[PDB]
Amino acid sequence: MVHYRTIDSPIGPLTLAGHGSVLTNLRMLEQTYEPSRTHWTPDPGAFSGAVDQLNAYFAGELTEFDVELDLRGTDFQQRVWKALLTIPYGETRSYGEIADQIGAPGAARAVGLANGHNPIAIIVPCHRVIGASGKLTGYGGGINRKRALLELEKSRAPADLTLFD
């Protein structure tokens, strides 16, 4: 059983969906074919916390999420998504680095494919992974969404101006 809520965002309407307070999905679903969504119940007040944190994220005021997640995918996808969760705000990794981390040296391209299937964007940070040649990927506007998120995280001001005096 699954309910959903859509919010505005600088990168487009973000659909949050899941069961109870647990997220199963977070995607900019517009202009794409998503047949699951027809089986979902709208609930304009679900995921109160996640929406606040997302809003705070986009406003620069949040860096670490505290949200309940239920990730579904293959063993290999789960390993990749788990490793994605270890990438700090404002940092990046290469696909090769991620393949090394999950114990599959040489599997950069597989990580790229699994990264593409990430059901929960932003919070599981598939945008923080980039290949050696530096080119963003993703159809349907994906490239521009990723870039937006990367530019936001890079623009982060120092955490405490008092440290300068």
Swiss-Prot record:
Places the protein is found: Cytoplasm
Catalytic activity reported: a 6-O-methyl-2'-deoxyguanosine in DNA + L-cysteinyl-[protein] = S-methyl-L-cysteinyl-[protein] + a 2'-deoxyguanosine in DNA; a 4-O-methyl-thymidine in DNA + L-cysteinyl-[protein] = a thymidine in DNA + S-methyl-L-cysteinyl-[protein]
Any Gene Ontology biological process: methylation
SUPFAM superfamilies on file: Methylated DNA-protein cysteine methyltransferase domain, Methylated DNA-protein cysteine methyltransferase, C-terminal domain
GO CC field: cytoplasm; plasma membrane
Assigned EC number: 2.1.1.63
Signal peptide start-end: none
Domain of life: Bacteria
Gene Ontology molecular function terms on file: methylated-DNA-[protein]-cysteine S-methyltransferase activity
Pfam assignment, any one: DNA_binding_1
Active site: 126 (nucleophile)
Swiss-Prot/TrEMBL keywords: Cytoplasm, DNA damage, DNA repair, Methyltransferase, Transferase
Family (UniProt): Belongs to the MGMT family.
Function: Involved in the cellular defense against the biological effects of O6-methylguanine (O6-MeG) and O4-methylthymine (O4-MeT) in DNA. Repairs the methylated nucleobase in DNA by stoichiometrically transferring the methyl group to a cysteine residue in the enzyme. This is a suicide reaction: the enzyme is irreversibly inactivated.
Other notes: This enzyme catalyzes only one turnover and therefore is not strictly catalytic. According to one definition, an enzyme is a biocatalyst that acts repeatedly and over many reaction cycles.
Protein name according to UniProt: Methylated-DNA--protein-cysteine methyltransferase
Native organism taxonomy: Bacteria, Bacillati, Actinomycetota, Actinomycetes, Mycobacteriales
Gene that produces this protein: ogt
